[PDB]
Amino acid sequence: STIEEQAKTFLDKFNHEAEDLFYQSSLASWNYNTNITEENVQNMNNAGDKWSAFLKEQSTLAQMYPLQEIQNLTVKLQLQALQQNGSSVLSEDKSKRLNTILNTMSTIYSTGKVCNPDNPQECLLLEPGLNEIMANSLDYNERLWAWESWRSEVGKQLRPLYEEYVVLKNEMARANHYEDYGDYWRGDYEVNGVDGYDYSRGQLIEDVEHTFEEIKPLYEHLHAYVRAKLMNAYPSYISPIGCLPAHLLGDMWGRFWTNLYSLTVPFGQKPNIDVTDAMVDQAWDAQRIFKEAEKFFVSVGLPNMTQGFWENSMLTDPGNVQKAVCHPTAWDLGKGDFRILMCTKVTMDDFLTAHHEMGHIQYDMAYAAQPFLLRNGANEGFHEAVGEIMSLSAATPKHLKSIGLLSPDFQEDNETEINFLLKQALTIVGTLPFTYMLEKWRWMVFKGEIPKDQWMKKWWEMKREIVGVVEPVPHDETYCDPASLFHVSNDYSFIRYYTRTLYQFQFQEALCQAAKHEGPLHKCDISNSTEAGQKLFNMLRLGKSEPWTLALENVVGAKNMNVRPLLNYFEPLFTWLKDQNKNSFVGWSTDWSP
Amino acid sequence: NLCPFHEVFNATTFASVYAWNRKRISNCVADYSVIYNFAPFFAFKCYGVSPTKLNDLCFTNVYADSFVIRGNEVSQIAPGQTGNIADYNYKLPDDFTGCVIAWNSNKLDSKPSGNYNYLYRFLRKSKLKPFERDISTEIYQAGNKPCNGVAGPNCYSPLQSYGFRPTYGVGHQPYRVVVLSFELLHAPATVCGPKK
Ligand SMILES: *[C@@H]1O[C@H](CO)[C@@H](O)[C@H](O)[C@H]1NC(C)=O
Ligand SMILES: *[C@@H]1O[C@H](CO)[C@@H](O)[C@H](O)[C@H]1NC(C)=O
Ligand SMILES: *[C@@H]1O[C@H](CO)[C@@H](O)[C@H](O)[C@H]1NC(C)=O
Ligand SMILES: *[C@@H]1O[C@H](CO)[C@@H](O)[C@H](O)[C@H]1NC(C)=O
């Protein structure tokens, strides 16, 4: 028996045992998320301990077979995923210190309650209070107070922990035969062994930078329009030539500009599209919503869902008798069990997110034939891109008219298309510069080529030039403003939101080209297109077996991130912006001084 | 005389696929209509014999192999198939004049705690042959180093379990499969169909 045959046998035994234990762990987690008790917490703890203890032993018995003696590619990928040392390279004391640091950071971010104003009796929490007062606020002083109060009390707590967390993560990454933790993270968009379809962990940086350079003019036009619209509401608070203050971007950290729509809608007289009224008047429930979504998927060509999905998914909150978190998530519990957990209201947003999680489920069933370690997207943006394709398609007025929520009396015009494209750009384009900024900063920090005594200095100077958001007040080095973000504090990769944004529009362009759709791309409908369904399914069924380069080419025809689908998607909006903001300055000055 | 056609289909427990149960049926009236009592039959393939002309021929013996597999492994119970059931657990010949009957048993079998009593074999030195049974549980060494007993780094005990929870998908649910194989040896046939 050769080393590769030994690897095959080991990987098969693994796949089986891992599938069993993963089903047990996922079922325990689903029981908890549908029923928050103490017995359910204990069940998750036991199942997760068993799963992690199995994964450690299987990794330490996978280290035996070297990769250099393996000629197969699927076996190579499975053993590469299984042999990952992870945090085991660190000593016991260092590993426990890192775990304690991560837990303390997560608890500080989650339980953070700030109480500067008046007596500490009045304090707000993340979800209802701080988000409610940051999303919809017209008070510059109040917004500044909230932003600087959260950035001061919290960041000062994370920074002493964050520096040592960075040191420990960099040490672990170096011990893992990498260059830094940034390289460890970039090792996900890496292909080695395939000729013609290969990727490098620095090639990702080059590609991301080139794509952002391509996207930049559209972002500058959108930024100028946003500043011009914000000026009318906010007098004497934003300069005509300078950048945009960070605390007035709707979100807590300015990740999304979606909430900045009431102050930026061009055609206020023209009503926006919304089908909530007709949806609730036509006696529509969660069952009907999901039945319509599965009808759309069947019309596209994808297979229907199991009868167990309907009887096991919890689509509505079961009242206050039992408490259950209803964050919309699609569950792939393993052995043929697909469930969706969400609190479905009769709303356009809930309909769209039902389509999104249903696309996630379709992706999960597509690669159900792949081995356990290859049951994932080609990279970490493919799943969200696949879901967002169907979210984009199901929101079109043509599809709404076809299904029945939109009356035929309604007409489509350039004003409506501009409103829809502006909302889409605020949601989608406005997050790409921020994501690229954050991941560039984190990569530079982990690489260590920059010094440590100017973390916030470099963070702010990169905010000025990349995203165009300025510091409302000066910040010293005791702050840790990047750590205030959930992904930064909880040790999460953030380039996935950059990559998925390009991938989803590439997929939409390819599928609409294969659906013989004529006209603008934003008015497309993948529905009733078995050709588009088959083309998407070809990439869907691959999973992680084929390299993401080949998976992208199998459905699109390109080999990397392309900005052209995004640009020709937003071409009508871009042309309208160019026509409209010609009398106002475009861009941000570098000479601004508070 | 009516031999246990009902007892094979209506049995409290069904054997594992790796060690399946074979019953030799002889000296009978045919009474194939007892088989058709069960409505939810997931598969009624009838390779080599008409599914309506069974009650006209005579065979020396009839074998009713009964076992439990997954839903996506039912397709491997057919002449010429390949997988893990068709070459390590239960292979049936290329000719195979007979019928394959399978129906879902997610209620009788399966258990929320995990029904690990139903096992299958996933490792063998050589592929199985038509109608062969491998009950031995000797550990299948992966390569280049004898285990001299117990399992280890590249040892690997061969039998693998199903688990069969009731929340599994349709292709991962238990399926009681009863395979009828008619034997036509050049001997006085003992099983015949009724006729006036
Ligand atoms: C949910 O938890 C409650 C808490 O006592 C208990 O009835 C049972 O464990 C679960 N019930 C249901 C209906 O899920
Ligand atoms: C790797 O092994 C699998 C075994 O199922 C096989 O299907 C595949 O073709 C092999 N890869 C190559 C490149 O031969
Ligand atoms: C799924 O859709 C198909 C349409 O091709 C239909 O025949 C089938 O009954 C549906 N099944 C479920 C469970 O919705
Ligand atoms: C898809 O085709 C069906 C049948 O012709 C039709 O009822 C439905 O409105 C179509 N949907 C779309 C979005 O074109």
In our burial notation (b when 16+ CB lie closer than 10 A, e otherwise), range A506-535 reads bbbbbbbbbbebeeebbbbbbbebeebbeb
- State in Å: Cα A362 to ligand 3 middle: 14
Q: What are the C-alpha distances in Å from A480 to residues A476, A477, A485?
A: 10, 8, 10
Looking at the CA of A30, name the nearest ligand.
1
Closest C-alpha to ligand 4, atom 4: A528
Q: What residues of chain A lie within 8 A of the CB of B171, using their CB?
A: 336
- Kindly state the tokens that stand for A209: 């930078």
Best mutation site among A35, A317, A320 for ligand 1 pocket (most ligand atoms within 8 Å of CB): A35
Range of the domain at B117: 5-192
Interface probe for A, chosen from B145, B154, B157, B159 (most Cβ of A below 10 Å), is B154
- Contacts for A172 with CB less than 8 Å, ≥ 6 apart: A87, A89, A90, A98, A181, A184
DSSP 8-state assignment for residue B60:
S
**Residue B25: count of CB within 10 angstroms of its CB:** 19
First-to-last CA distance in chain B? 16
Hey, are the CB atoms on A10 and B167 less than 8 Å from each other? Answer: no
Q: Residue B132: which residues within 8 A CB-CB, separation 6 or more?
A: B91
Give every CB contact of residue A21 below 8 A, 6+ residues apart in sequence.
Answer: A47, A50, A51, A54
Report how this structure was experimentally obtained: cryo-EM
Residue B165: its chain A contacts at CB < 8 A?
Answer: 23, 27, 335
Q: How far apart are CA A179 and CA A185, in angstroms?
A: 11
Counting beta carbons within 10 angstroms of the beta carbon of residue A50, is it exposed (0 to 12), middle (13 to 18) or buried (19 or more)? Answer: middle
Query: Which listed residue (A190, A292, A294, A357) is catalytic?
Result: A357
Closest Cβ–Cβ partner in A13, A23, A307 for B156 = A13
Cα–Cα distance for residue pair A483/A491, rounded to 1 Å: 10
A190 flagged as catalytic: no
Q: From the candidates B115, B172, B173, B175, which should be mutated to test the interface with A, based on the most A CB atoms within 10 A? A: B172
Are A405 and A279 in contact by the 8 Å Cβ rule? The answer is yes
State the residue for tokens 């206020």.
Answer: A268
Q: Report d(CA B75, CA A447) in Å as an integer.
A: 54
Nearest CA to ligand 4 atom 11: A402
Query: What is the torsional sign of CA A132, A136, A142, A144?
Result: positive
Q: How many CB atoms lie within 10 A of CB A544?
A: 22
Q: What is the CATH number of the domain that holds B143?
A: 3.30.70.1840
- Shortest CA distance from A336: residue in chain B: B169
Asked if residue A149 has its Cβ within 6 Å of ligand 1, the reply is no
Which ligand neighbours the alpha carbon of A338 most closely?
3
The total domain count for chain B is: 1
Taking contacts as CB-CB distances below 8 angstroms, the residues of chain B near A9 are 123, 142, 156
Q: Residue A330's CB: how many other CB atoms inside 10 A? A: 21
Ligand with minimal distance to A404 CA: 4
Kindly report the length of chain A.
Answer: 594
CA A401 to ligand 4 centroid distance, Å: 10
Instruction: Collapse the DSSP code of A576 into the 3-class scheme (helix H, G, I; strand E, B; otherwise coil) and give the result.
Output: helix
Cα-only R_g, chain B: 18
Task: Report DSSP state, residue A127.
Answer: I
Rounded CA-CA distance B160/B90 in Å is: 15
Residues of B in contact with A308 (CB under 8 A): 167-170
Q: Is A543 left (phi over 0), alpha (psi -120 to 50) or beta?
A: left
- Measured CA to CA, the distance from residue A295 to residue A536 in angstroms comes to 17
Please give the Cα distance from A574 to A567 (Å, whole number). Answer: 8
